[PDB]
What does this fold into?
Amino acid sequence: SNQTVYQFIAENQNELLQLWTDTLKELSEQESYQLTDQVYENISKEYIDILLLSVKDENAAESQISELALRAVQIGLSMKFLATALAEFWKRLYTKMNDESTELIWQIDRFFSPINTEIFNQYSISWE
Amino acid sequence: SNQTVYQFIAENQNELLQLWTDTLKELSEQESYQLTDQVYENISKEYIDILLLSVKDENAAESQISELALRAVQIGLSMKFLATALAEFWKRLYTKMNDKESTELIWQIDRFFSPINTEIFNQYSISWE
Ligand code: NA
It folds into this structure.
């Protein structure tokens, strides 16, 4: 069901990790300060863990989602920054997997959308 | 440039308002209570008004953004509900536009909406922070 996307992530973990770390770092340069590379790499790795627990849907990864959202809040990432990052993550995955295009986009969207919206929810909850 | 998407929104305002109002309503049916048709219509209208100010970026609609997000909080829409709704809003606009490359249309749509929606999510969360 989410097999094509899931399997690609599983098979391309090391390259995704680097890709997404680099995405966090690039976005951070637009912010008033930049955390260290290891901090962004750990966020990336936690995220990938979430994706690999989320083959069915966002439910299995409940505890890691809550941890990641709390961590984001605690270390000073805005919702704006996190949402921007997560949007860029799936788009950079697309470029990797694309390499029909439209059906791939919809595959990616079906796997990620509920994960990301649950992460957003738990970020807001970790203030609410 | 966001000209292509902006123009389609500008030319199809009444249609989009109905489409988005219906999406909200459909989604509300899975929540523990439903608000009124007018409440959801007013949300769709406030959102479209944001879009029409946003041809460059999300900055001109700062105040409108902040008001929409705050109202969402106050009326009891979760972030989950809001983020699901907004995702469906662009996807439904895609189906409309696409039926008039598909891939480049999606990226045009994403380019326009993504910074607006992220800013909405931010103001939603900030209402609590
Ligand atoms: Na767990």
